[PDB]
Amino acid sequence: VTASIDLQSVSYTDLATQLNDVSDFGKMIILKDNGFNRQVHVSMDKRTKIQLDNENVRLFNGRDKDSTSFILGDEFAVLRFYRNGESISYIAYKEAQMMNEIAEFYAAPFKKTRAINEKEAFECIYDSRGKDIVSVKINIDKAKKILNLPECDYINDYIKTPQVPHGSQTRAVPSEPKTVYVICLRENGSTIYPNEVSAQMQDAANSVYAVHGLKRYVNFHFVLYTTEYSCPSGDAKEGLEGFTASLKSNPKAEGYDDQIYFLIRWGTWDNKILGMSWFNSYNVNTASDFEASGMSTTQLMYPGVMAHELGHILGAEHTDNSKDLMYATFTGYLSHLSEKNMDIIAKNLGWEAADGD
Amino acid sequence: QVQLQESGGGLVQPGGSLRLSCAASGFTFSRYTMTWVRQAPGKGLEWVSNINSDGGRTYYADSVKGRFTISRDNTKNTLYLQMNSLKPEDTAVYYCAIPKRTYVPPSQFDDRGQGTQVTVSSHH
Ligand SMILES: [Zn+2]
């Protein structure tokens, strides 16, 4: 009777049929694999909206400790969850040829290696009964062990500016959350795939909502357009300074100088910097002049980079806790653990301790 | 193997209409972006139109926009090209094809049908 997804054959149409049937009451879906059966209570994520170039994208949550979640666009679907400590993504595109493109893309780093356990890290999933690829499974923890690439990091990934003077606006919980747009611009000459950008956006918004019950204060609305801007060199600081300047000469962006902006690319910057941000540059009461802007990679192997940079924009410092999203080297963790950072972030979104969690 | 078979070609006078059909088998048609291309004698292969898996998105060469309509029936595994307001320069063999990628205009294809001839005469 209960709906299920067979991970040995999961396709775009499987994911779309199951997730489109999720009502406001939620729905139990069993994830099945060889000797694996996880019952997941799936709900629509109504906190976040996403428009990419070509599609509206909807998000879905489980309520489990292994944070099962889904992404559903018109063109693609993602299932992500943790299993035995490691994050696993199932990525399924609707058009067979773009699925073929995506599979080739993700298979390419493993071409050199002939690892005996390759399928643990990367596997093409074939249509149920030459078969076609209908999804790919990626375990980035096992992939990192196999590929053994040099680590990218965040050292010196922000620009700090003289601290704002204090100037009595604080209020209780608003009757509705404030809508904050996160306007993402695909860097000129960059190829971004929708599963990769959407995952970063989901992780970014969710890193904020997990703090001080902030969905009462903010609902993020992501929008992705193309920009003619590209960073003039590999310098990240220079790149951001030029990006912020490019927002001021975009006649389309007039009227939205009080929103949050990211320049996104697939790759990284010089010294293997993953992103860049203006530090403590967004406050709900004062946001202006495109100051809440930053840059972020979108590659699947670096989850949470845009969350990390959004943390900086909202005032979060690096921490010494290697389990924190805000650690200065890349950890793959996705949650704020610093109480000081949590208080700073929430205060910039209008929360005060009197309001509770 | 992939099999594609075009039909519906013929000779018309300028201003005429034709409807091309392409019967597909050997692959899961309903999952694939599909393409019409055409080739005039001694000329390069010219992209005509794309349609995505479910028919919700269509794309056209500038020279055929407003005159040609691509469509598909995923239950009958058939691709269509409705050709109105035909002109002499539409004369060519027309092929339905699986493009290697979804980007437009495609120039690289995985398989093609054997083709159907479309001729539009001229008298000026
Ligand atoms: Zn940082």
Author numbering:
A (entry chain C): 34 to 162, 167 to 204, 208 to 397
B (entry chain A): 1 to 124
Sentences from the paper on this structure:
ETBF can secrete an enterotoxin termed B. fragilis toxin (BFT), which is the most potent weapon of ETBF and encoded by the bft gene. The pre-protein of BFT consists of 397 amino acid residues with an 18-residue signal peptide for secretion, a 193-residue prodomain, and a 186-residue catalytic domain. The fragipain (Fpn) can cleave BFT-preproprotein into two discrete fragments, the auto-inhibitory prodomain is cleaved off, BFT is activated and the catalytic domain is released from the bacterial cell.
In this study, we focused on screening for specific BFT1 (full length without signal peptide) nanobodies. Fourteen high-affinity nanobodies were separately crystallized with BFT1. Fortunately, we obtained two complex crystal structures, BFT1:Nb2.82 and BFT1:Nb3.27. The CDR loops of Nb2.82 mainly recognize the α-helix in the BFT1 prodomain, while Nb3.27 mainly interacts with the α-helix in BFT1 catalytic domain. The CDR1 to 3 of Nb2.82 has 8 residues (Gly26 to Thr33), 8 residues (Ile51 to Thr58) and 15 residues (Ala97 to Asp111), respectively. Nb2.82 and Nb3.27 only contain two cysteines (Cys23 and Cys104), and they just have conserved disulfide bonds.
